[PDB]
Amino acid sequence: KLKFWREVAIDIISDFETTIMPFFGNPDGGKLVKLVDKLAEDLILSRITELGVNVVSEEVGVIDNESEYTVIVDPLDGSYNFIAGIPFFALSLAVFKKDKPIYAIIYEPMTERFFEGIPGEGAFLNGKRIKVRKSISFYSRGKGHEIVKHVKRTRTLGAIALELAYLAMGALDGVVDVRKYVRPTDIAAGTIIAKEAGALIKDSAGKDIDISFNATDRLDVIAVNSEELLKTIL
């Protein structure tokens, strides 16, 4: 049931609103152990592990329960932003039945936005169908900038899970990250939601991105609006 996973997500969101939101903009959440990430991780795991599913997460690697279901957890996407008081951050969950994704969510606390990625139903924001529109996020340690000089404007918001959700919403045309920094724990839910809304998510090369069940893989995203745009970038 989706009904089951939706309910678990709402419970986590609710918990995050009361327990982690107090720490928005607080410098003490940046104490090394990063503290507010650990607090967020603990909150989610204390609910999720009870269900006896496998979990993958940057702080705990893979927890194997020989379970049919796998939950990829990003407890706080946009960690630096959250601590600094910059309003770009999200919680995310991607739920797999074996190797097929069945449910993904991104919740954006500052806007109260509930993004849903439901295979064989498409992408939703607060219940209402969303789809990419007919301007890009750009991350690069050096590469591109044949890109900069070739698009109307760029954004670099510091929460890549969230930027992908903006694409699925039609706030952006594309998300382009050509460092090899991003983990599947970052991009999983955002890929599912964007793909389900019409995004084309490929890699540095040009072949489709595949979501590994680890917290170690280091990736490139080229998630985009259209064939024309994709070609342009490649």
Quickly list H helices, 60-204: 79-84, 160-169, 184-195
Asked whether the beta carbons of 16 and 109 are under 8 A apart, the reply is: yes
Question: What does the radius of gyration of the chain's CA atoms come to, in whole angstroms?
Answer: 17
**173 labeled part of a ligand binding site:** no
Query: CA-CA distance, 17 to 203, in Å (whole number)?
Result: 34
**50 labeled part of a ligand binding site:** no
Contacts made by residues 52-56, CB under 8 angstroms, sequence distance 24+: 54/213, 56/184, 56/185, 56/213, 56/214, 56/215
**32 labeled part of a ligand binding site:** no
Asked whether the beta carbons of 106 and 92 are under 8 A apart, the reply is: yes
Coil vs helix vs strand at 191: helix
**76 labeled part of a ligand binding site:** yes
**177 labeled part of a ligand binding site:** no
**160 labeled part of a ligand binding site:** yes
Which residues line the annotated binding site?
58, 74, 76-79, 155, 160, 179, 186
Which residues line the annotated binding site for substrate?
77-79, 155, 160, 179
Which residues line the annotated binding site for Mg(2+)?
58, 74, 76-77, 186
